[PDB]
Amino acid sequence: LPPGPFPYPIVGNMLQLGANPHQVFAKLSKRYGPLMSIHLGSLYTVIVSSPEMAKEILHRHGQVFSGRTIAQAVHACDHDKISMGFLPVASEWRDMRKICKEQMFSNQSMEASQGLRRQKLQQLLDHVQKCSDSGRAVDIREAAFITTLNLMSATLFSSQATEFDSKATMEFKEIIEGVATIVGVPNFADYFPILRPFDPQGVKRRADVFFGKLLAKIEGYLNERLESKRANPNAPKKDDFLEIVVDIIQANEFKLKTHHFTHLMLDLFVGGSDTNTTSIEWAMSELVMNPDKMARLKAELKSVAGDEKIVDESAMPKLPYLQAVIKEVMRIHPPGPLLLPRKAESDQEVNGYLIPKGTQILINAYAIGRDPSIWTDPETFDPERFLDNKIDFKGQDYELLPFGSGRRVCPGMPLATRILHMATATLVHNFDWKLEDDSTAAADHAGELFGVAVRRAVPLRIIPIV
Ligand code: HEM
Numbered sequence: 001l002p003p004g005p006f007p008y009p010i011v012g013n014m015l016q017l018g019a020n021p022h023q024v025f026a027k028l029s030k031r032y033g034p035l036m037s038i039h040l041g042s043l044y045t046v047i048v049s050s051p052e053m054a055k056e057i058l059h060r061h062g063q064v065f066s067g068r069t070i071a072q073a074v075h076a077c078d079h080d081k082i083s084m085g086f087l088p089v090a091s092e093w094r095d096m097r098k099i100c101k102e103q104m105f106s107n108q109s110m111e112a113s114q115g116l117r118r119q120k121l122q123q124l125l126d127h128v129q130k131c132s133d134s135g136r137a138v139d140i141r142e143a144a145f146i147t148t149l150n151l152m153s154a155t156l157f158s159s160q161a162t163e164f165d166s167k168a169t170m171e172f173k174e175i176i177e178g179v180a181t182i183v184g185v186p187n188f189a190d191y192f193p194i195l196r197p198f199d200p201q202g203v204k205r206r207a208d209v210f211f212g213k214l215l216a217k218i219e220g221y222l223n224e225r226l227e228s229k230r231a232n233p234n235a236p237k238k239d240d241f242l243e244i245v246v247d248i249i250q251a252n253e254f255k256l257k258t259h260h261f262t263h264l265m266l267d268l269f270v271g272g273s274d275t276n277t278t279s280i281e282w283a284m285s286e287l288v289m290n291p292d293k294m295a296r297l298k299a300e301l302k303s304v305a306g307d308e309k310i311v312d313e314s315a316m317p318k319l320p321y322l323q324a325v326i327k328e329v330m331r332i333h334p335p336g337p338l339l340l341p342r343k344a345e346s347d348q349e350v351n352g353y354l355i356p357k358g359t360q361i362l363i364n365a366y367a368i369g370r371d372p373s374i375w376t377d378p379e380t381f382d383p384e385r386f387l388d389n390k391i392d393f394k395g396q397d398y399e400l401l402p403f404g405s406g407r408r409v410c411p412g413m414p415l416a417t418r419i420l421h422m423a424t425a426t427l428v429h430n431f432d433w434k435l436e437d438d439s440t441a442a443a444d445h446a447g448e449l450f451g452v453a454v455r456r457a458v459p460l461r462i463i464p465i466v
């Protein structure tokens with residue numbers, strides 16, 4: 001087996017992991033190497049912490065390591081048996097992946113939804129404008145959370161709401177926060193198989209309530225769309241994912257049930273919410289703490305957009321520094337520092353070590369992104385490192401893997417980048433920013449809180465001015 005720290009009886013290595021396990025794993029792998037055995041109680045795991053080992057796992061043996069480890073929380077409303085996120089690579093997963101690649105996240109579909117997202121960006125602009133008149137600090141975590149939910153809801157459901165914090169949006173927010181509280185804590189049933197039948201912390205029960213809330217809303221949206229399409233055959237076709245769902249269902253070309261689609265929408269909606277929310281916050285935090293970089297991005301946006309307030313997504317090719325800024329946030333602050341787990345579908349040898357069937361595989365993208373043997377000055381925020389650099393986060397550069405790579409690489413990347421780039425551009429272009437209070441500024445920026453997505457323990461509070 002790969003080398004690693006001595007595992008104690010019963011608990012394995014679990015007692016050493018602390019509040020930020022990805023940081024502990026990063027330091028451990030400096031000692032034990034880029035393939036490292038960790039015993040999460042009885043859940044045997046191997047940590048991957050090199051670009052070289054990530055390529056061996058995700059690409060050379062990408063089919064063997066194509067499975068997922070499935071947390072007990074994921075069994076809520078039998079999501080584990082329906083979900084593109086957790087099914088094994090097989091016909092049903094392949095069909096759902098094809099639907100996302102060729103129809104939902106196509107260039108054609110992303111361009112068609114650009115206007116839906118533009119109005120949500122305008123709503124964000126207006127909201128921040130009021131705080132700026134008042135002189136009030138903006139809580140960037142909450143602003144990014146609402147904006148991301150609004151942008152996701154627009155793209156997936158064409159949600160209407162003229163208010164920034166609409167009641168539909170705030171119900172989504174309640175649900176997403178609830179899922180994060182549940183999953184964001186250790187479920188001992190995940191680590192001790194004798195406890196699974198018992199659900200001793202009620203994690204799966206509590207997850208059922210939130211998953212059910214979300215599926216109920218999605219099923220309602222789907223049924224409403226089906227009825228309005230039936231009643232209004234001549235109305236223009238909407239440019240959202242729900243329209244695509246409906247057409248695919250009624251064309252009946254896929255061996256997929258209705259719940260595959262509702263659960264896919266669930267997966268996509270939750271998929272883009274904490275991830276973009278924390279990333280937007282980190283982007284603003286890095287820029288506020290590195291005023292030279294804030295100035296350089298402002299200068300680019302001024303040059304390209306000038307007096308326009310809302311950048312078109314179509315303009316992204318003209319904004320290389322904005323792209324470099326987001327790459328650099330992804331390098332330092334991958335929202336999931338250990339990505340989503342993979343699983344060995346069979347015994348496999350890697351670098352002379354046996355990786356047994358069923359091993360949980362965690363890619364420590366965070367460690368790789370901060371490894372000094374790979375990145376110069378790894379702890380410094382330096383977007384310029386990506387200018388005229390062909391390294392990207394699409395999965396082909398194993399130094400930068402915030403979205404994974406190989407078989408299960410994030411299918412929502414096309415939408416995520418549009419959200420990240422535009423939310424950042426809107427905030428940076430239209431206001432200057434100061435910390436509400438800079439007395440513990442460095443500590444506020446460094447302090448991470450682990451969870452579904454790793455985020456600043458202290459929410460960023462900054463005052464907008466013009
Ligand atoms: C915003 C930043 C985002 C990051 C950093 C991110 C990252 C990731 C990562 C690391 C994975 C696992 C990849 C692997 O197994 O190799 C993943 C999977 C996934 N992501 Fe994302 N993601 C983001 C946004 C989104 C968005 C916007 C959506 C939906 C629109 C989404 C939907 C998914 C889904 C459904 C999967 C599961 C795919 C599968 O297992 O086949 N993500 N993401």
Ligand SMILES: CC(C)C1=CCC2=C(CC[C@H]3C(C)(C)CCC[C@]23C)C1
Pocket residue numbers: 074079083085266267268270271272275336339340410
């Ligand atoms: C984008 C990446 C990080 C992501 C992680 C968690 C989520 C993904 C999409 C779907 C979603 C559920 C199926 C609702 C289960 C909890 C986490 C997970 C799998 C996608």
